């Protein structure tokens, strides 16, 4: 599994800030937009994109405050990411797109798709954000820590002061051990504690047990849309999984229209790090059917 990131940096000015993005593949045709989550960057797509770039434009931005993008003085609420991602898509002149999305990137992608369905030609997704109505429906192995993350005292001490979301949560979202080189890539945007606000606000935005109500409502809305939409859907899932355990993938396979579910084998949250070969190859095959 490759550890390098051989993509030329590109920057675009968005709402007075610079946003870094990967942009490879042809110039014409429908682009494929890859959206990462927490605490990753476009680095998480590094071994997926090379399967698609031979025949389709691949665009992979770093969310504001993450990766190589600028780090303004913000709270880094989901609403902040929505505003910047909306402007990013406009700044690039994108019309129709195919989405490939993960974790908070899937919240952004599904929310954009719900608001602009005529422009979405397909969605490939994995380990995505859905409403978690109670803590009992959150995976047991992650309950105590995410409950502590969602406080302003201990949660900030863990995530901001001790960088626990990078040194702990990230590696336990991958089945295989991440190498020192790979960890250093993920650590790079957050070496300074003063830059770690996105890592704490994101888990505090997760729609769990009715809080925050605004996020619960928006996620419920895009899940209702997805259940009614004829858009082609490609769902990757693994075992044991984290956000999408095998039982939930099964429920989704049955209920979502026009959906193919693909079992990647062993996987937790960062499925791209455990089976990039299958994920990239399957996306490349699926795009020809859209
Ligand atoms: C959309 C966002 C959702 C992403 C899904 C989450 O992906 C991760 C998968 O779920 C992980 C479940 N993990 C936990 O609940 C958890 C247990 C322990 C710790 C933690 C670790 C973990 C690993 C590690 N290296 C092997 C080191 C630590 Si430390 C820094 C010693 C630690 C200290 C304290 N006080 C608490 C917890 C840990 C974590 C972070 C998560
Ligand atoms: Cl999170």
Numbering used by the authors: 4 to 293
From the paper:
Here we present a GSH-sensing platform for live-cell imaging, termed targetable ratiometric quantitative GSH (TRaQ-G). We hypothesized that a SiR dye in a spirocyclic form would be non-reactive against GSH, but it could isomerize to its zwitterionic form upon binding to the self-labelling protein HaloTag (HT), switching both its fluorescence and reactivity against GSH from an ‘off’ to an ‘on’ state. In conclusion, we have designed, synthesized and validated a new ratiometric GSH sensor, TRaQ-G, which only becomes reactive in the organelle of interest. This sensor is based on binding of a spirocyclic SiR ligand to HT, which induces isomerization to the GSH-sensitive and fluorescent zwitterionic form. We conducted X-ray diffraction experiments and MD simulations for structural elucidation of the different TRaQ-G adducts to gain mechanistic insight into the varying GSH sensitivities of the molecules.
